[PDB]
Amino acid sequence: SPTX
Amino acid sequence: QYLLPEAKAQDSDKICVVINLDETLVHSSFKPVNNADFIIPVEIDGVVHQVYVLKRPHVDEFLQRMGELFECVLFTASLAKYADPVADLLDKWGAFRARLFRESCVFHRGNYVKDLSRLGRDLRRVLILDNSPASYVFHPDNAVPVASWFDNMSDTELHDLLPFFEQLSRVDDVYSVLR
Ligand SMILES: [Mg+2]
């Protein structure tokens, strides 16, 4: 995932 | 080399606060929602996906004020193609003097750690605000913990943290309080  | 250059002169005498993005200031997801504050397009292997971002309450009050009190720095384990646009849209007041993303973290025991040693500041004058204690394992005494936020529109935690930060902003050595 590009988030977290 | 260090992650940050020298503090620019009005910031020299300020404590440097490292601030996390996801679950700390916003919460984002690929699941469509109607009340997203931001929608961000993110390209992953040639496909453009939409990321829906909600703002934690009092985030605007919080950043504007922290931006006055500290040399604020965004430090996130998320990729720039996500985080950088969100900071663009979130940070109306220019609180963030710098932004660090996943490649600036240290990958260690399966976790992306924010290694505060790599900033290039005196750790007596560094704080980290991060919802995930795994992010600061190398420096747990530099931390102001904050609960993970997802969608509670009743959350008041960033508001209620400001008084503590005001009083930290004054001290010489953050450990004199966190130990
Ligand atoms: Mg986070």
Side-chain angles (χ1 to χ4, degrees):
Chain A
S1 197
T3 84
Chain B
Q1 295 232 322
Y2 285 130
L3 291 178
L4 312 183
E6 301 163 36
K8 282 131 56 226
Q10 81 279 355
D11 289 333
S12 284
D13 305 343
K14 279 167 183 158
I15 287 162
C16 170
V17 190
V18 151
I19 306 180
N20 184 231
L21 185 62
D22 292 298
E23 286 76 57
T24 299
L25 300 176
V26 296
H27 172 70
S28 292
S29 148
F30 301 81
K31 156 58 149 188
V33 80
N34 282 335
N35 56 332
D37 293 295
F38 312 128
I39 293 174
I40 311 299
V42 176
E43 179 257 298
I44 293 145
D45 308 300
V47 193
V48 180
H49 296 90
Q50 290 164 321
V51 180
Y52 297 76
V53 188
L54 299 163
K55 293 168 61 177
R56 193 170 189 155
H58 302 259
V59 71
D60 291 325
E61 166 178 49
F62 175 77
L63 286 179
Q64 171 174 33
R65 193 47 181 146
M66 295 282 309
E68 294 171 334
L69 296 170
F70 297 109
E71 187 200 10
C72 288
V73 169
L74 181 73
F75 204 166
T76 180
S78 74
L79 294 167
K81 60 162 83 151
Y82 163 73
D84 219 24
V86 170
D88 272 2
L89 296 153
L90 180 62
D91 188 18
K92 308 184 233 269
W93 310 272
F96 294 130
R97 310 302 193 297
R99 300 177 190 185
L100 300 165
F101 304 105
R102 183 181 294 164
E103 61 293 343
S104 292
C105 292
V106 185
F107 197 55
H108 183 263
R109 275 168 212 147
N111 280 317
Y112 279 108
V113 180
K114 285 100 182 186
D115 189 346
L116 306 182
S117 308
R118 270 175 80 210
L119 301 171
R121 299 278 180 283
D122 187 313
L123 294 178
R124 300 118 118 198
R125 307 188 62 68
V126 170
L127 298 169
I128 169 157
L129 175 76
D130 198 317
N131 64 293
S132 146
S135 296
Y136 45 84
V137 281
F138 308 160
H139 294 94
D141 292 318
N142 286 81
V144 183
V146 50
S148 287
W149 182 83
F150 298 84
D151 52 15
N152 179 22
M153 286 334 281
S154 259
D155 187 278
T156 62
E157 192 142 314
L158 297 175
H159 187 90
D160 304 334
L161 270 173
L162 281 171
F164 187 55
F165 271 115
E166 236 136 16
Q167 73 185 47
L168 271 165
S169 67
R170 299 161 129 68
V171 315
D172 281 315
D173 185 338
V174 287
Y175 302 134
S176 83
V177 187
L178 313 155
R179 292 150 49 270

